[PDB]
Amino acid sequence: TTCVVVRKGDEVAIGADALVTFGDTRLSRANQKVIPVGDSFVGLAGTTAHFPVMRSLLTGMGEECRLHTRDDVFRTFLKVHEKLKNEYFINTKEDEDDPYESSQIVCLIANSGGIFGVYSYREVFSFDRFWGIGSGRNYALGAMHAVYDRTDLDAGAIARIGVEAGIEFDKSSAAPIDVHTVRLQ
Amino acid sequence: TTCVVVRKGDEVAIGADALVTFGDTRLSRANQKVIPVGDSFVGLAGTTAHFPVMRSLLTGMGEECRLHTRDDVFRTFLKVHEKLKNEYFINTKEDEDDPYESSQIVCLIANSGGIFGVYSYREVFSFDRFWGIGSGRNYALGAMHAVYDRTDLDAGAIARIGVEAGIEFDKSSAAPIDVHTVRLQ
Amino acid sequence: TTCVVVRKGDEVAIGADALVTFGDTRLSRANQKVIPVGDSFVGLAGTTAHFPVMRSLLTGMGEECRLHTRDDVFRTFLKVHEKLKNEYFINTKEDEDDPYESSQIVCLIANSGGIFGVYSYREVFSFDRFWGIGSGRNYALGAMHAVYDRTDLDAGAIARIGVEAGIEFDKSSAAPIDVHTVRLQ
Amino acid sequence: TTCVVVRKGDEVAIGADALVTFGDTRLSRANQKVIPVGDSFVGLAGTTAHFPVMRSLLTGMGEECRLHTRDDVFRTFLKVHEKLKNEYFINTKEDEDDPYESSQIVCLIANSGGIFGVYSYREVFSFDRFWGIGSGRNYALGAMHAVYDRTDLDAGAIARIGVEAGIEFDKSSAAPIDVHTVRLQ
Amino acid sequence: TTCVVVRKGDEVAIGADALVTFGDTRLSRANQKVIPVGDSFVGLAGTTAHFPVMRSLLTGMGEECRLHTRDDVFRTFLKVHEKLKNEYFINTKEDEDDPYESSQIVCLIANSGGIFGVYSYREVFSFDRFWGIGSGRNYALGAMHAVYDRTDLDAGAIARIGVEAGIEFDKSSAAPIDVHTVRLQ
Amino acid sequence: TTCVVVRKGDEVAIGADALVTFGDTRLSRERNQKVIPVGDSFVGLAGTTAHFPVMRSLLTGMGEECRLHTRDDVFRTFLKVHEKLKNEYFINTKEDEDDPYESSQIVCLIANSGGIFGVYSYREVFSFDRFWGIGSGRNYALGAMHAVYDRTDLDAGAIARIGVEAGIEFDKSSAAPIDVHTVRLQ
Amino acid sequence: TTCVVVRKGDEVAIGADALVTFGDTRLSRERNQKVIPVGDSFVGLAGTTAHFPVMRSLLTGMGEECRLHTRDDVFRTFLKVHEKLKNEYFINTKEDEDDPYESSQIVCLIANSGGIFGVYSYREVFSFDRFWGIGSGRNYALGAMHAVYDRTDLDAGAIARIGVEAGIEFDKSSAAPIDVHTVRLQ
Amino acid sequence: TTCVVVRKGDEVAIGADALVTFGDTRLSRANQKVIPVGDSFVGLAGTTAHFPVMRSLLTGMGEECRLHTRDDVFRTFLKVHEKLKNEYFINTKEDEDDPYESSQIVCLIANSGGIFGVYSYREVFSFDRFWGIGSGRNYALGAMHAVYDRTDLDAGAIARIGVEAGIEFDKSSAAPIDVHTVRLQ
Amino acid sequence: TTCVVVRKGDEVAIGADALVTFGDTRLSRERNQKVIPVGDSFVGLAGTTAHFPVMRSLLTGMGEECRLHTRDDVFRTFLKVHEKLKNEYFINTKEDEDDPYESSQIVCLIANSGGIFGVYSYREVFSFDRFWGIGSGRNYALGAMHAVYDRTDLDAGAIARIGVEAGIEFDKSSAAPIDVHTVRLQ
Amino acid sequence: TTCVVVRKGDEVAIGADALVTFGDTRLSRERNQKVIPVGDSFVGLAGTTAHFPVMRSLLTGMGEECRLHTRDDVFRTFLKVHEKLKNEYFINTKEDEDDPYESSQIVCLIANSGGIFGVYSYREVFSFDRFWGIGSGRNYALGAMHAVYDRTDLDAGAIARIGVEAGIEFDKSSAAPIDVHTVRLQ
Amino acid sequence: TTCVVVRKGDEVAIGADALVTFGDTRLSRERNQKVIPVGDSFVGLAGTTAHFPVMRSLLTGMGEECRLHTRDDVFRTFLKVHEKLKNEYFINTKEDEDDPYESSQIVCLIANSGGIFGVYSYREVFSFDRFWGIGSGRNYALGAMHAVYDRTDLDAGAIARIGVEAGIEFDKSSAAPIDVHTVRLQ
């Protein structure tokens, strides 16, 4: 996976690749990993096997899923954690003494309030210019960093360039590219 | 095991091999891994040792076992998870940070509503053309992909060809082949 | 251990060896692993160290220990699981994602209702001709398979031949042989 | 440790060595591992570090510590398990699927009712002639087996010979030898 | 990370580097690891991924976050442990038999009451001259020890020198340096 | 990688995908790198891209002493490849008899007018009647080729393409474009 | 694999299954690949299919210097097989005395007019009086042959078939058809 | 650490070294590991990181901390275990099947009632002449054993000699030596 | 480390960061230590700082016998480097064919008027058309150079600088200042 | 161990602690054991006390053939030390290029009128401009020396003492007394 | 095992326990097996009883070429012991410089009129001023001897006895009776 979020000027963008697999076996589809949730867009980290519950949970919430500030995203995903446990019987533990782990990344978020990342359903970050997640994200970060200050490139174009870089070098990332842009409030 | 599901035109099909073992020792029988549940057919993944409880649970449910839509299959297997714990004292945990694991696959499903797969009793997928599970599934996927667009082949015939491929190359798959077809609503 | 069950004609049989050990050290006795439970015979898998509680539990049950059908054996051993936990404070967990393990085998059963095997106190199987368990069972299965269709051999004789094979080749199986026969209802 | 129990004629005996250590460091004393409990004698298996609670528990019980039959010893040590958990906050788990382990041995017992062994606070055995436990027990078993049928040797003398053998060959067994004899009822 | 605390004369100081990472990937920022909590300064140990909850918890407490004595810091962080569990569903276990582990370090603290360190949310230390934590702390300790008795250097200057040493030699420490000083009561 | 060989009628074929990587990082490339013309044979290389240059240089440099049209010839030729690797390039290729089957011991598939062959551990040579495949996508390829081999409208080249297509469809370590070469049997 | 040898009366027999695989993937084949005629003896090969070609080529190429009709002859012959593997084919077959029993050290079973034999680690040779078997299905085979050996209506060939049948019945790594050869004792 | 207790004549003594570390890094101090608790002295085993809670707990108890007999010490430290769990949320588990482990040692104790050692907060020992704990204790035991019968040496002098030996040979033991003596009742 | 090579138009470039460490402890230094002038080529060294001195001493001492302007020349030259390491400096550099891709087998990148090259395990030599990079920050560098390569205002030197900048930005084991050298193609 | 070398102005210094152990058990000693006079140089030995006697005997016995006043001389000298260890004392000192940085490969620090040096794996020699340190207490020492190096009142000897003091203060495997030797640069 | 050596005044002593085992099983014995008279020296052997016979046979057979009265003599003698073990008895005794301290590398303690010595890995020889000990009970022994060494009424023999007594008291792998030999210094 290569998923990125970008912020520049009065616009934000979220970009993602399309590859979905059950382990090493590719699954052909009719984008599955980027979800519209109200007027936000959420890009899911991790294995395809865990997408259906997350899509069903976030899209079903509706009004109680508030994402336009860091505190709102934080309180919302605390509620996502509780719903996973009580309704779907899924565990999402966090221990403070654990080091950084990629499998604890939940999602990136883009809306008119800004661009955000969620770690372990509890730790929420806000980003000023860009960030990315998944197996192709290091390639994406280098690309977006190299081109961000170009005057002819908006947030959507920078996000596309980020995903292109991930697809170019990562075997676990593949075309087509899905990009959505949103104007800041 | 090689178990497949196929959808083409106004018909769906489910196909499975017959090999059942306790570990490395083969068990001779009078098909054990494909179960009629109401008007659906369910193909069980995993070891033969865990078949009896699953067969007893699914066939005993009756009316509360609804499988003709993705949401119905989802809610039904959430109930299967609870029954396993409360009635049969069997555990089926899911952690979100876990990667893809073959031992979390529950079953494939075929009925007049379509063809489905269930992962970890919670994550439900719908398939457009075909899918397969078990040790011989990679051979089966290649075979079904190669022949799906043949105008002379219906869903039942494609499923047979899928199971044939699994039997040909996988030591843990064996004849005879069991195939059932159902007309879409 | 080599323990077998056989069914042929109007008779069933259960056969077992006599070797009992605490680890690698042999224990001399005055058969310990085959138990009469009402009008059934139960052959215990696993270490000698866990025999006393199982013998005490099964023989103490009496009327609530019903074993003449697959469903009865199933419900009975669900109750055995609960008694082990609540009365004797012993754990018998099952996880669905676990593969086949020999240490989960509980027993073989022979009575006028047929011949049965119990796995993990929850999964119950019925056998048509024969089966065996323990370290010498592969030798036993080969022997019984080779001689089953002999017109001069009844169920008791086939079971003896099964245990003989286990004793011949397995260091963890030893004479004398204990065989009991029961007429089918 | 080398601890043995013997039964012959109208007498039983229990024998033990004297070595006590905290790990590899020897502890000099004013026998610590053989305990008088009412009119029985109990020989403790395992590390010296766990002796004080066991001595305090068994000797404090008094009348509710009944040991003269297999069933009595069984029910008594079920109560010992509960007291360890509820009063002393010590765990003694048993899983049925576990293999034989020396660290699950609790004690040998000798009284006018016979000679007994307790495994995992739940599984109780009765012995006809002799048995032994601890690091020197294999040497002891060979010695007692070789001399048991000697007409000039009683149960006490056979037990001494058993402990002598353990002391001779096992570095974790040491003199002096402690032997107690009891007449059968 | 290199974070230090210093006490000398009528002044204390806290010093920290600026490097923040998600694993091996650096995160560019607009100091994130040093937090003003009332009139104290708290420097956070461990991964950047766990900063947001800790910052949100400590700054939200307000009056119930008392830090000017060893006992106050102790009782306050016991409450931090409970809030993490009950409000944020985060675990912070301590076992007494565990050895020293760097991942159990919580923070260093500097205020008008003195300089403190917190280990595992339960064990609180007070320091007379200085201490440091994180991957560059050994370099920092050597530097501060070498220069502490210099008559021209106050607590703030000694802390800067400590962080400089960490930045010089540790790849996981980077400029700019953040230092805050506070007068003792 | 998905590489296949096929034999049907008077024709044989060899097919391969194009993906080449240094570990997990893709390398953009130029004609197919893993299928090599060696005289009038075609050789498809198994394993990591990092070990391709020496193998390409060795096989193409041999010329006349690289004889591949029979099982025995392929066998003796690759014994010589083993010796050259050790003595000229200082590379080790050990075989122990007690070792089990390992995919990292696969060397190559071969197609020429003498037939279709596979080489394991530079010493064990097999001949195939209808088809075979190697690499991470080969199980998908085998299922596809098995399912379509008896089709009267499909020749050896077409069956090989279908094999590589299946590997590309399902294996993340296999990618288009597909390279196929056909040769008439002698 | 299930391979057995039997001796009874004036006849010996060798029996084997037909399943051959590259790892977990089955290879379709042609006559039985794992039983080899070597002069007037029959040799049944243990272990992975990947190591069959060199062993077949070595044993069948020896000819006159491959003498197998006594325990000492089989012993000296397979010492020479060990040396040829190392010097000609550059394959290692080490033995350490302190190693325990390992199934991957089994080389073959042998049947000829001199008797029935087994070879372990190319150095340790055994002679059998009634029967033995090797491979993943051998425990089932041993039980079957033991149960039926004393039947007056069954000769060595029939007992061997029954042994292989038992292996095929219960072992997933054993498959039909069954190959049996009988030889009269000298 | 080297901590010892000695008993001779009408006097007992407790001796300890001064080295305190956070892992491999030494901490300079203004003795931290020997605590006065009422009229007893308690020497703490294990890492410096766990000292503050133990010091705070034992010194805060006061009258309910009774230590002058084996049974009193036993009941007192059972209460210490409960307080650690309920007040400080610290775990101190004991399993009976565990072997001897140095990390389960709690403390040595010296008072007018005698000299004691506590293992796993539950198992209490009394010593006749001497004992020691920590990384330098083997050197200390050899020294004290060699000199105990010297007529010119009292309990305090023997304890000093014990700690001297630990300091001489153990890198994790360091001067100065702290010794306290108490007259037996 | 972040080291890159670039080729565009009539120019090539090599770029590297400056960070050098003994393990986790930084060493302050002097000109760039990891980029070496060897005749009229520039060589960027992969791996730990601890192994730089012998490699610098060996390559710069060779002189005329160190020929690097073609793939074959670089190949033969580094075969000789392998032999010198063993015979003169008593250092081992083994390669086994069955080993997978490993980053610790990377030797160097090379830039000269003949083109841009990479050397793996002293034996496997690659030529690059546009760019490549090695070391802990190379993935960031590859993404940056790929994103900007087709810019008409950027030459090979500028693209290399941008590559190293990206590595320094995100990798803790890469640090300023940046060292870049450009060479005109023959 | 804490051993340091310093260079400042016209003087160099070498400093070391005194702690020597067989494993965890301290050995009481006599002058400093880990700093050796070799001609007019001083050599500070890294690693376990158990390996000191052979190294002391070898270096002090060499005499004239032990030349240490330049980087190349130190390099050639310790290549000879490696050969003597193998041929005379039957001790192995292997280096593999693909190995990462390891503290157990550190041999010694050196101080003489030619400068201050460090030797890694008997083959890789470094020269230092201001200071360096080795052993378990070296990180504390580096921080101390870095913090005080630019003090106008401190010479090379005083900076080295301060370095060893820091190691002794914080490292349990470092202990007083401190041994320091100074030498004037040529 | 507890074995010690002591030096005080004009006398040295060597002391040892008597316990000998094959693994965990005790072997009953005869005079002390682990202390050997070699000419006019006494040698106490470390390690398992299983390796005593060759060492006893080698050292006692040497005679005149076994010189032990100085550190250099002991050193050269045990270099020769290493060579004899390899060439005559086919036993390996490797040393790698990068290895840490290991108790299984201890060879022996030595006492004679020249002083008291210890040998590590057949190559590293130490001389002791007051005392030392080896084996599983040595830490107890060191503490005892340290505590009593300065007693005016105790000679070297008495201090050694006290050392072995301490080992026997606390170590399960040490047992009575105690064997002590004293020798006057030259």
Author numbering:
A (entry chain B), B (entry chain B), C (entry chain B), D (entry chain B), E (entry chain B), H (entry chain B): 1 to 30, 34 to 188
F (entry chain A), G (entry chain A), I (entry chain A), J (entry chain A), K (entry chain A): 1 to 29, 32 to 188
Article passage:
The second hitherto unknown bacterial proteasome family member was primarily found in Betaproteobacteria, hence its name BPH, short for Betaproteobacterial proteasome homologue. In this study, we present the first experimental characterization of two bacterial BPH proteins. Their crystal structures reveal homo-oligomeric double-barrel complexes with internalized active sites akin to those of proteasome and HslV. Unique structural features, however, like an elongated inner pore loop with a highly acidic sequence, distinguish BPH from its relatives. Confirming an initial hypothesis, our cluster analysis shows that BPH branches off from HslV and appears to be its direct descendant.
In contrast to the Td-BPH crystals, the obtained Cm-BPH crystal form was not compatible with an assembly of 7-fold symmetry. The data could be scaled to 2.1 Å in space group P6, with unit cell dimensions suggesting two monomers in the ASU. Via the 6-fold symmetry, they form a dodecameric double ring with intersubunit interfaces reminiscent of the tetradecameric Td-BPH but resembling the architecture of dodecameric HslV. A closer inspection of the Cm-BPH crystal structure reveals two malonate molecules from the crystallization buffer to be bound per Cm-BPH protomer, specifically intercalated into the intersubunit clefts of the rings from the outside. Like wedges, they bridge a part of the native intersubunit interactions formed in the Td-BPH rings, thereby leading to an increased curvature favoring hexameric rings. These hexamers are presumably stabilized in the crystallization process, allowing for the tight crystal packing depicted in Fig. S5. A potential result of the smaller radius is a different conformation of the pore loop as compared with the Td-BPH structure. The smaller radius allows for a tighter interaction between neighboring pore loops within the rings. In contrast to Td-BPH, the pore loops are fully ordered, although this presumably represents a non-physiological conformation. The apparent ability of Cm-BPH to assemble into closed rings of ancestral symmetry, albeit artificially stabilized by intercalating malonate molecules in a rigid crystal packing, demonstrates how small structural changes (mimicked by the malonate) can affect the oligomerization symmetry within the proteasome family.
